[PDB]
Design a protein around this nucleic acid. Structure first.
Ligand SMILES: [Mg+2]
Ligand SMILES: [Mg+2]
Ligand SMILES: [Mg+2]
Lengths: 324, 41, 95, 49, 141, 52, 109, 80
RNA sequence: ACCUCGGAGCAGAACCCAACCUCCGAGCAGUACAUGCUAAGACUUCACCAGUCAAAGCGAACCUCAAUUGAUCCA
């Protein structure tokens, strides 16, 4: 009993009478290419994906690369493969051109949009730069999705970005102890004149990040908002809790997001200091508890099982003596 | 005394082992070289 | 077997059964696997690991072995440093 | 078991407790045929003893 | 104390949480088929006719971090977008981009001719010297 | 054609294990693993057990 | 003059049809040649038998077959194909049911 | 209470105060448990043995964290 | 003429299915010496006996073939 296929079958259109007249995959790599393309296409049978899922620019760029390939040391160095690339120019120009789309990818991969705005995606146009002071010599930078200790983030960071009002926001998307939905902010500076931060109205002042011990690894969001019209807004963790979605819903008329930088934290001893010193509570300690192992229903006669079978179903490893 | 004689004998033979292994792998390389030299003819 | 002996008029145990099997007090018979010490040179180590095991018996094998021994063999035994002693009482059955 | 026997007057703890006193209080039944060599104390019930 | 009202079950919805405790599942299966799906992050090089391309992906296929020569920031400092210099360049750039994404462990699985290519040995040397280990830690069971 | 021989450990001794080897080739020395030393150790073959 | 041929049935085939809950290590299907291939969270024994690596639900799909490059049989079978021709096989997946553990509060230090 | 414990030496109280800092309470109390037995004698003995082990060791998975710290210091290479 | 084991048809599509039914075969060889030790969960020749597969673990590296076989006692 045949039922006919629903859509087109694969290998139908290429199925001809003269295969020897058809040019073939001479390689392994071409089949891997075509094969991946057919993997990504939507099909009608059941697949794995169902279940587990202007002109001046080209002018100056053409003359720029045309001037670049003309030098003799570039060709001679490149053919002797000792030519390299300055990583800094690539870094800053990456910060300029196509960096925003990549920070959009990192915010989509780290689930900042599904959690921070219920899926309202946007593009971080502003190349924001945040760094924490590490003593006096050096300073730990915050890029999108880095690991920074809460010792490094003990003191409120230096924020520099090249722009022209602004409201900057830090949150902890997961660090909420009670509610599985809300998040504790850490500092919310508003009505910021230009690109200096100190003259902002410090509405909610700076906490360091506090991830609990053994509660895994936390992500911490630096939002930076284009502000149009300056609005007035508004250690108790019942007071640091809000949600950025319905916060932003109140103020989305004259404010749009323009910058991201987010990072990870784990536990450190400074978080002992945060819970005991300035929050004044005992610290909660978590542990990753795996589910108990499946064993089938115990039988009276466990035929052909080894003698270990009786130990799968006991709970004390000590000699019990019964009525005696 | 049985336990000490066994334990001592094992400790002695194990002290003599790494040299015997290095000699043995050198003999393996002689079987490589002589084997491949017998492959040529 | 002998159901009534000629001297005592009692049942007798089959001594093959005692020589090969182990009665745990809960009613389970433990045995050794057949061929666990034969032709080990041609057996894969998974199979040799399977043969060196103490394997429980069937229900009807168990009742056949109960009928072939007597009440002496069905009795609590408080040995000194018994290896199988933690396997006599049956823990945590839900029938 | 032995705390149980002492509480119900069956084993007098103001005398030495030999094996005869555990038999006469009927705390322990031991049979010398069937080669019991006597009693072993058991740690069950060590707390609350 | 009102402050220390902690829910008995912490909910961490970091997508990269369980993978950075090296606890999360890898797709263990797929043994008859190349490549193996058993990783958390894969480095996938796409060498076209004109351009070298480098990806960092999850098992989802969500491209986490990319670096192509089809990008003005990197393209203009190069002589040719396809040579070994292009791969060492895209290795430095890719590695620097991945340290700042909190990604430190990829898997790179090449075909046995792409393994023994010079440009991918140079790419791997660029990645390892950059700071990225091209081998994931095992899953803790 | 083949012979089942025993292989006696040189150290951590009393440990044997059996192998196959051809009738015609030389006396085996191997690097097997002693679980008594818990190391890899040279074994030397001492007696042919059975000509399979 | 036809001696032999008295061998019994191997009792192979699928043990867990699609939709069936499966615990870790259950044999999904035993085959004699690869009728089904291991997909996500499904392992293969020496006897080409498909067992399960996670607890979840068995699903069968149709996927693009791209063999390992060191598999010269199937790779030589590839390069004879025309330019659009793509091989498919049926795969078996276990969609894992449980999370692999939760964070639980342990102590208020 | 680890700080007031006269019967532990002062350097050993510092080594215990540092190594086993994840057992120490808010109130400075070293807290340590055992749930390895049905008999509370054997659990108490297990606790006391943990203490004697801490004083004797104090008198006289990591790899992933090694690498993530080395890369965090490679991003720390950013001065004023 | 045969007596045990395996492959194919009979038996077209889960499993099973006979015949002094139709055709092929097997009673090994080769490589390796971690062909180490342990252990959740399973399959199973329609019983039993035998057979198979196996994650995690400890210890290390960084098996092919379909069949390729023999219980207990005794030596
Ligand atoms: Mg047949
Ligand atoms: Mg039949
Ligand atoms: Mg059956």
């Amino acid at each position: 009993r045949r039922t006919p296929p629903l859509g087109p079958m694969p290998n139908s259109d290429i199925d001809l009478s003269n295969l020897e007249r058809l040019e073939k995959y001479r390689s392994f790599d071409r089949y891997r290419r075509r094969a991946e393309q057919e993997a990504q296409a939507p099909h009608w049978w059941r697949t794995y994906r169902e279940y587990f899922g202007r002109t001046q620019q080209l002018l100056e760029r053409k003359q720029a690369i045309q001037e670049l390939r003309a030098n003799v040391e570039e060709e001679r160095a490149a053919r002797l493969r000792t030519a390299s690339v300055p990583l800094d120019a690539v870094r800053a120009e990456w910060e300029r051109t196509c960096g925003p789309y990549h920070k959009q990818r990192l915010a989509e991969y780290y689930g900042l949009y599904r959690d921070l705005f219920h899926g309202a995606t946007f593009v971080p146009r502003v190349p924001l730069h945040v760094a924490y002071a590490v003593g006096e010599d050096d300073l730990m930078p915050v890029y999108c999705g880095n690991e920074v200790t809460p010792t490094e983030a003990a003191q409120a960071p230096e924020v520099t970005y090249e722009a022209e009002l602004w409201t900057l926001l830090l949150t902890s998307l997961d660090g909420h102890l009670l509610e599985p939905d809300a998040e504790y902010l850490h500092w919310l500076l508003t009505n910021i004149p230009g690109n200096r931060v100190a003259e902002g109205q410090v509405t909610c002042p700076y906490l360091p990040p506090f991830p609990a011990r053994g509660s895994g690894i936390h992500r911490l969001a630096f939002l930076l908002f284009k502000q149009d019209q300056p609005i007035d807004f508004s250690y108790q963790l019942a007071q640091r809790t809000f949600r950025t979605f319905d916060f932003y819903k109140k103020h989305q008329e004259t404010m749009t997001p323009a910058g991201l930088s987010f990072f990870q934290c784990r536990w450190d001893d400074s978080v002992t200091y945060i819970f005991h010193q300035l929050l004044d509570m005992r610290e909660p300690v978590f542990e990753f508890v795996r589910p108990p192992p499946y064993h089938p229903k115990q039988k009276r006669f466990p035929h052909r099982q080894p003698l270990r079978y009786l130990d799968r179903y006991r709970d004390s490893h000590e000699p019990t003596y019964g009525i005696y | 005394q049985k336990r000490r004689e066994r334990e001592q004998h094992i400790a002695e033979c194990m002290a003599k082992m790494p040299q015997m292994i290095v000699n043995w792998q050198q003999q393996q390389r002689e079987n490589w070289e002589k084997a491949q030299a017998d492959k040529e003819r | 077997l002998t159901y009534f002996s000629a001297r005592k008029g009692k049942r007798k145990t089959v001594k093959a059964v005692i020589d090969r099997f182990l009665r745990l007090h809960c009613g389970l018979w433990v045995r050794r696997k057949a061929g666990y010490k034969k032709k080990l040179w041609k057996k894969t180590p998974a199979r040799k690991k399977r043969l060196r095991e103490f394997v429980f018996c069937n229900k009807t094998q168990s009742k056949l072995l109960d009928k072939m021994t007597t009440s002496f063999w069905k009795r609590r035994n408080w040995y000194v440093d018994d290896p199988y002693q933690k396997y006599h009482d049956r823990t945590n059955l839900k029938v | 078991r032995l705390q149980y026997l002492i509480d119900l007057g069956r084993v007098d703890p103001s005398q030495p407790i030999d094996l005869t006193q555990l038999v006469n209080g009927r705390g322990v039944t031991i049979q010398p045929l069937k080669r019991d060599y006597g009693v072993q104390l058991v740690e069950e019930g060590a707390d609350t003893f | 104390v009102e402050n220390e009202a902690v829910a008995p079950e912490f909910t961490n919805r970091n997508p990269r949480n369980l993978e950075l405790l090296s606890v999360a599942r890898k797709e263990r299966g797929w043994r008859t088929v190349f490549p193996s799906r058993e990783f958390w992050h894969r480095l996938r090089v796409i060498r076209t006719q004109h351009h070298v391309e480098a990806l960092v992906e999850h098992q989802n296929g969500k491209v986490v971090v990319s670096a192509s020569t089809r990008e003005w920031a990197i393209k203009k400092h190069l002589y040719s977008t396809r040579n070994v210099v292009a791969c060492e360049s895209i290795g430095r750039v890719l590695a620097q981009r991945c340290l700042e994404a909190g990604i430190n462990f990829m898997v790179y699985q090449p075909t046995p001719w792409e393994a023994a290519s010079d440009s991918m040995k140079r790419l791997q040397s660029a990645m390892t010297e950059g700071g990225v280990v091209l081998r994931e830690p095992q899953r803790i069971y | 054609k083949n012979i089942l021989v025993r292989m006696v450990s040189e150290a951590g001794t009393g440990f044997c294990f059996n192998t196959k080897r051809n009738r015609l080739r030389e006396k085996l020395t191997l690097l097997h693993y002693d679980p008594v030393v818990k190391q890899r150790v040279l074994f030397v073959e001492k007696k042919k057990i059975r000509s399979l | 003059k036809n001696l032999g041929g008295k061998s019994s049935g191997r009792r192979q085939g699928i043990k867990k049809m699609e939709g069936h809950y499966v615990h870790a290590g259950n044999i999904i299907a035993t085959q004699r040649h690869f009728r089904w291939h291991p997909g996500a969270h499904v392992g293969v024994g020496k006897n080409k038998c498909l067992y399960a690596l996670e607890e979840g639900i068995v699903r069968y799909t149709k996927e693009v077959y791209v063999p390992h490059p060191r598999n010269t049989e199937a790779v030589d079978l590839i390069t004879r194909l025309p330019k659009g021709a793509v091989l498919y096989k049926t795969f078996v997946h276990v969609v894992p049911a449980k999370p692999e553990g939760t964070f639980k509060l342990v102590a208020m230090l | 209470h680890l700080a007031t414990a006269e019967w532990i030496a002062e350097p050993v109280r510092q080594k215990i105060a540092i190594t086993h800092k994840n057992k120490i309470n808010r109130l400075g109390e070293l807290i340590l448990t055992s749930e390895s037995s049905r008999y509370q004698f054997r659990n108490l003995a297990d606790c006391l043995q943990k203490i004697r082990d801490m004083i004797t060791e104090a008198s006289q998975k990591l790899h992933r964290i090694r690498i993530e710290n080395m890369n965090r210091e490679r991003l720390r290479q950013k001065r004023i």
